[PDB]
Structure formats: structure tokens, C-alpha cells
Amino acid sequence: GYAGEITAAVALDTVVNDPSAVLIDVRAAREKEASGVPDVPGAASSKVLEVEFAALEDKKLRSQLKDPSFIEAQTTALQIASLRRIGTGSKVILLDRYGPQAEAVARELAKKGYSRVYVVTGGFDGRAGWIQSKLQIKPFT
Numbered sequence: 487g488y489a490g491e492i493t494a495a496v497a498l499d500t501v502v503n504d505p506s507a508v509l510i511d512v513r514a515a516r517e518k519e520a521s522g523v524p525d526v527p528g529a530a531s532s533k534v535l536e537v538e539f540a541a542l543e544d545k546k547l548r549s550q551l552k553d554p555s556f557i558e559a560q561t562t563a564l565q566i567a568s569l570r571r572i573g574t575g576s577k578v579i580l581l582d583r584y585g586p587q588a589e590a591v592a593r594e595l596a597k598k599g600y601s602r603v604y605v606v607t608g609g610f611d612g613r614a615g616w617i618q619s620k621l622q623i624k625p626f627t
Contacts, residue, residue: 487601489592494619497579497606502530506602507577510535512562512591513610517583518626521611524581525622537565539587559587563594574599584612 492500501509511523515538526534540561542548551557572578578600582588588605595603608615617623 487596487599487603489589489596490602490604491607492579492604493614494606494608494616494621497581497604498524498526498621500577500579501533502527504577506575507579508533508535508572509579509581510537510566511581511610512537512539512588513581513583514539514541515626517610521583521617522623523626524610524616525624535569535571537562537569539582539591540565556590559590560594562591563598566591566595567598567600574601576600577602577604579604579606581606581616582609584609584615 497509500507509524511518511534524534540558542551542554542558548554566578578595580588580592580603585605585608588609592603592605606615608618610616
């Protein structure tokens with residue numbers, strides 16, 4: 487279908503109380519090192535997944551491709567759609583740094599039949615995002 491939006495506080499509530507929901511951090515290892523990661527109640531920790539944004543690091547290859555940032559978003563969505571644990575009925579919440587990268591991934595994931603995809607508004611660091619919403623965070627490990 488189409489990607490949706492969810493505030494960070496509701497994303498927290500959903501990953502705790504919706505057994506069909508997962509929270510997928512799509513930030514780069516680097517972004518998590520700098521800012522930390524979500525600290526969620528214990529039972530819910532296993533529902534927070536990590537699919538790092540599928541960056542094309544090879545600058546030589548990158549300079550040859552049409553719209554490489556779209557290839558990266560498509561590749562991240564393909565990896566998420568291939569997670570054994572979830573299917574198209576799962577509620578899939580995506581968390582990036584500021585919002586727009588998660589939006590690109592969510593859009594491609596919805597084209598694969600995932601009808602319950604949501605992006606955390608503001609991401610982790612952005613306006614009204616995770617940190618700004620006064621949710622708890624912990625160092626990246």
C-alpha cells in the first residue's frame with residue numbers, strides 16, 4: 487500500500503503492546519554511535535530490529551549508477567522484506583535519524599505489499615523525534 491506516520495511516543499507504545507509490531511532502526515552504525523539507540527522496556531527489546539541503511543560505499547561504483555540514493559533505499563527495503571520474522575501483515579515501524587530516509591525506505595517497502603508500514607516522525611534526532619519526545623536512549627553497542 488502506502489507508508490504512514492507515527493509519533494515516537496506512539497511507536498514506543500506500539501512496540502511494547504502490539505505483538506505484531508517491530509521497530510526497525512535503519513540508521514547507519516555511525517549515526518547510532520553518535521546519538522545512541524532506543525531504550526525500551528525489557529519485554530519489548532527483542533522487537534527492536536536493526537537493518538542498517540544499505541549505503542553504497544564504493545564511490546567508484548556509486549558514480550556510475552542512476553540515482554544511487556534510490557538504489558540504497560530499495561536495497562534496505564528488500565532486506566527488510568526478507569526478514570524471516572515478519573510478513574506483509576506485520577506492523578513495521580521504521581526509525582532513521584531525521585525522517586526522510588525512513589520515508590524513502592517505507593515507500594519502497596509498501597510497494598512490496600507491506601500495508602502497515604509507519605515512519606517515526608522526526609526520526610531519532612529530528613524535530614519532535616525520539617530524543618526530543620523525552621523517551622529514553624542508551625549507548626550503541
